Amino acid sequence: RKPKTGILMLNMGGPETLGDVHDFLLRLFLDRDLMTLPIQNKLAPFIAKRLTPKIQEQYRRIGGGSPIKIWTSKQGEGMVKLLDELSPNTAPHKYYIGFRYVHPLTEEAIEEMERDGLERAIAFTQYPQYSCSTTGSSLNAIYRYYNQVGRKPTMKWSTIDRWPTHHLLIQCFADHILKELDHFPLEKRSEVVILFSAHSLPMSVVNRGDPYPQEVSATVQKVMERLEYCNPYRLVWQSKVGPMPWLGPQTDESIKGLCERGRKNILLVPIAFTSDHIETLYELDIEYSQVLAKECGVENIRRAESLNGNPLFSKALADLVHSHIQSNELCSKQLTLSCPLCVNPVCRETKSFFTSQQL
Amino acid sequence: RKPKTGILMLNMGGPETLGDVHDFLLRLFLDRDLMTLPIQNKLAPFIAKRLTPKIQEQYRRIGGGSPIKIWTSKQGEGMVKLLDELSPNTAPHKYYIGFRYVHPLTEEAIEEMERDGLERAIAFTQYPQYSCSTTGSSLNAIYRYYNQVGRKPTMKWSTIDRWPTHHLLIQCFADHILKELDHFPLEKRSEVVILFSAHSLPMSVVNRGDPYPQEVSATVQKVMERLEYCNPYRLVWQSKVGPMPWLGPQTDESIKGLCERGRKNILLVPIAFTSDHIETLYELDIEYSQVLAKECGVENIRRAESLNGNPLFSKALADLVHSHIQSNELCSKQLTLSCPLCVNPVCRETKSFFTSQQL
Numbered sequence: 001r002k003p004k005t006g007i008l009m010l011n012m013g014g015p016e017t018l019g020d021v022h023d024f025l026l027r028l029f030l031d032r033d034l035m036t037l038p039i040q041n042k043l044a045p046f047i048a049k050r051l052t053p054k055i056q057e058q059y060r061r062i063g064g065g066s067p068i069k070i071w072t073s074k075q076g077e078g079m080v081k082l083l084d085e086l087s088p089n090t091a092p093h094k095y096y097i098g099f100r101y102v103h104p105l106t107e108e109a110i111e112e113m114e115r116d117g118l119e120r121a122i123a124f125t126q127y128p129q130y131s132c133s134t135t136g137s138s139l140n141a142i143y144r145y146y147n148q149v150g151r152k153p154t155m156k157w158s159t160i161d162r163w164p165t166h167h168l169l170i171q172c173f174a175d176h177i178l179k180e181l182d183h184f185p186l187e188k189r190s191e192v193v194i195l196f197s198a199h200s201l202p203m204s205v206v207n208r209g210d211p212y213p214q215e216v217s218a219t220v221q222k223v224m225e226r227l228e229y230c231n232p233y234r235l236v237w238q239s240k241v242g243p244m245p246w247l248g249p250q251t252d253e254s255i256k257g258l259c260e261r262g263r264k265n266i267l268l269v270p271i272a273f274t275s276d277h278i279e280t281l282y283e284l285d286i287e288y289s290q291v292l293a294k295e296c297g298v299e300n301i302r303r304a305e306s307l308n309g310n311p312l313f314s315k316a317l318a319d320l321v322h323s324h325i326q327s328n329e330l331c332s333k334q335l336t337l338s339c340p341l342c343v344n345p346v347c348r349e350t351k352s353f354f355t356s357q358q359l
Numbered sequence: 360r361k362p363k364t365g366i367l368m369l370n371m372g373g374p375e376t377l378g379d380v381h382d383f384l385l386r387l388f389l390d391r392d393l394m395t396l397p398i399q400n401k402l403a404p405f406i407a408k409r410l411t412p413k414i415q416e417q418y419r420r421i422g423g424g425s426p427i428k429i430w431t432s433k434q435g436e437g438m439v440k441l442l443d444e445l446s447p448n449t450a451p452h453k454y455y456i457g458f459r460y461v462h463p464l465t466e467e468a469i470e471e472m473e474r475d476g477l478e479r480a481i482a483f484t485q486y487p488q489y490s491c492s493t494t495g496s497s498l499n500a501i502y503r504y505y506n507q508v509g510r511k512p513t514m515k516w517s518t519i520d521r522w523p524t525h526h527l528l529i530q531c532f533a534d535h536i537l538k539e540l541d542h543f544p545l546e547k548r549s550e551v552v553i554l555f556s557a558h559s560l561p562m563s564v565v566n567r568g569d570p571y572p573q574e575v576s577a578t579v580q581k582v583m584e585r586l587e588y589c590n591p592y593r594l595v596w597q598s599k600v601g602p603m604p605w606l607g608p609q610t611d612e613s614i615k616g617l618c619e620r621g622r623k624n625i626l627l628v629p630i631a632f633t634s635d636h637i638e639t640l641y642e643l644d645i646e647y648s649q650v651l652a653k654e655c656g657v658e659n660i661r662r663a664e665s666l667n668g669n670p671l672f673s674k675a676l677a678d679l680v681h682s683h684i685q686s687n688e689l690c691s692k693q694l695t696l697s698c699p700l701c702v703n704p705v706c707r708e709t710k711s712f713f714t715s716q717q718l
């Protein structure tokens with residue numbers, strides 16, 4: 001039967017092989033919604049070639065490439081199977097992957113969705129917490145695709161643009177935390193400090209009103225509520241690059257600082273993404289857990305398993321889509337408010353593209 | 360009957376008359392737990408005398424002094440009346456006010472509590488969201504009091520050191536928001552943007568691991584969950600002083616920016632304090648709502664009423680103390696973890712003062 005409802009799963013993506021690294025970096029530094037640079041069209045290419053060896057080596061250290069597509073595909077597959085039974089009036093459902101910086105690109109997915117002849121299209125960001133730099137950039141790409149191509153969509157669009165406190169997302173984090181807590185020595189279980197770690201933002205982004213830090217905080221609070229505050233925790237921030245100010249404290253300095261102050265049993269919880277990727281497999285597991293943690297003399301440092309193939313996460317995805325369909329929502333109420341100091345004209349047009357959709 | 364249980368209500372405090380301003384500022388600039396300054400013991404009196412006229416004028420503009428003591432006393436009285444009936448086994452209950460920077464000082468309250476011969480003492484911070492600069496400094500003053508006087512306490516101590524998501528605190532915020540939403544023109548109700556406003560922190564404090572921003576974010580999310588996301592919102596930060604970087608976006612720049620971008624109906628929500636004080640009556644109501652708002656051409660800007668005398672708030676306080684008593688808790692689990700980059704040796708000794716208390 002002809003696919004009726006398309007679910008576009010949005011993620012920045014990662015290079016699947018070492019050969020994909022260069023184009024990945026090129027598209028990344030060209031993204032003006034992620035960063036603005038002195039003559040983007042020219043400075044980007046240079047940076048991409050300069051950094052390709054370093055980034056290739058990082059991916060070599062974790063097996064030769066990004067696992068994002070594998071996990072996204074597994075999650076998409078399980079989601080669609082549930083949706084076909086959950087929501088027969090909108091079935092058959094089909095998932096599409098729209099990566100921002102690697103193939104299949106957001107634009108290629110949109111083309112296929114259109115070619116497939118869908119009645120309904122759902123832009124489903126895979127970042128639970130909204131940032132204009134992540135979800136915002138992916139939604140702008142959808143708007144820009146139709147504007148630059150110069151035609152109107154042939155399908156009804158809507159977006160699930162954030163979901164930082166969905167009860168089943170929270171349950172999967174809490175489950176993975178408890179499972180990892182059981183792998184500590186029983187005599188140290190109560191010693192364990194939970195470090196929720198999320199990708200940081202430059203302070204220039206924070207200070208213009210990005211909703212991300214507050215939404216990440218909401219996710220952390222719901223998880224710890226569900227765990228009944230069994231262990232002490234902090235929310236810390238990773239992956240800062242460059243010389244400008246970023247939101248701290250940094251995850252690596254926090255691990256170092258805790259160890260030096262006698263807190264030598266630490267559980268890392270990646271709280272802002274739903275699968276393994278370079279940030280967990282390289283930055284946390286190699287850069288921080290292996291090297292840093294042993295130079296500072298940790299007793300035990302573990303990391304909760306990423307959500308990856310957990311079938312409860314697939315139900316979380318399908319419930320989110322199901323509720324979105326039943327509610328006839330076009331977008332969250334939060335998307336209707338642009339950042340108080342937003343300087344980007346596209347954000348207004350992208351917002352109105354979704355709020356104005358025919359039902 | 361002899362008071363049995365003392366509830367020490369901790370707050371920074373504010374000058375009750377213009378004559379109290381100077382000493383208020385002197386004690387503030389001497390607080391090493393709030394800030395460090397060169398030649399503090401004599402640079403503080405210098406800054407205090409220099410700024411006294413300016414601060415006196417701000418207090419004159421709102422009626423001649425701080426209302427914190429009036430509201431704290433009203434709230435404490437209602438809390439005691441409920442606690443005597445909620446928990447007869449710990450009655451009679453008596454509240455004490457321990458202000459950090461004005462009379463009655465934290466140290467003076469501890470002396471009266473000891474003199475009253477209480478069995479049980481509860482350090483009850485009036486900041487729902489923990490910051491080392493607020494609750495931390497107040498708790499440190501209790502530890503230092505016994506340290507400097509050189510004796511151990513004659514009453515069993517414990518602390519309610521944070522409560523950012525207490526369900527009755529949340530309900531009081533939501534009630535005051537809805538009440539204020541009704542005061543907008545009906546045709547603009549759905550268009551109102553809710554700006555939750557909280558005192559900012561220097562980035563040096565944020566970056567050392569202060570839990571305040573994450574806890575404020577949690578309060579915001581719980582309030583908006585209760586309001587069923589009826590309106591769009593942002594969390595923004597006020598009261599920055601000095602030239603160093605502070606956590607933004609700033610409340611004033613945020614109001615200006617929204618107004619210039621066509622969002623002309625704004626509801627301010629003081630989310631990090633429980634009564635009116637200089638931040639609401641002067642900074643928000645005069646500096647931002649009257650002055651700033653007039654310049655930018657806003658249509659309607661209102662501020663949710665402070666919790667002040669709301670009897671549901673008194674019920675919240677008594678509920679917190681009662682549950683604290685029933686649970687035999689000495690402090691939150693979160694207090695057992697000092698900041699990952701804490702450089703203050705007192706924080707560990709204060710923490711261990713509370714965790715080691717005889718039950």
Ligand SMILES: CC(C)(C)c1ccc(-c2nc3n(n2)C(=O)CC(CNc2ccc4ccccc4n2)=N3)cc1
Pocket residue numbers: 034035047127131133134199200201202205241242243272273
């Ligand atoms: C020095 C050179 C090498 C030229 C460079 C300069 C700047 C940058 C850079 N990197 C940024 N910049 N700027 C932003 O402005 C915003 C941002 C947010 N990104 C997220 C936010 C949340 C996330 C959650 C889950 C998973 C991923 C997430 N990613 N990352 C990169 C390189």
Ligand SMILES: CC(C)(C)c1ccc(-c2nc3n(n2)C(=O)CC(CNc2ccc4ccccc4n2)=N3)cc1
Pocket residue numbers: 393394406486490492493558559560561564600601602631632
């Ligand atoms: C330039 C001169 C004049 C020398 C100056 C310099 C610096 C400061 C200054 N002010 C700070 N500094 N440093 C901090 O490091 C931390 C802080 C936190 N304060 C809160 C945090 C939450 C709150 C919630 C509810 C109610 C009140 C709250 N207050 N305030 C004052 C003056």
Ligand code: FES
Pocket residue numbers: 132136209210337338339342343344347348
């Ligand atoms: S940058 Fe946040 S809405 Fe434009």
Ligand code: FES
Pocket residue numbers: 491495569696697698701702703706707
């Ligand atoms: S400053 Fe936060 S615990 Fe010492």
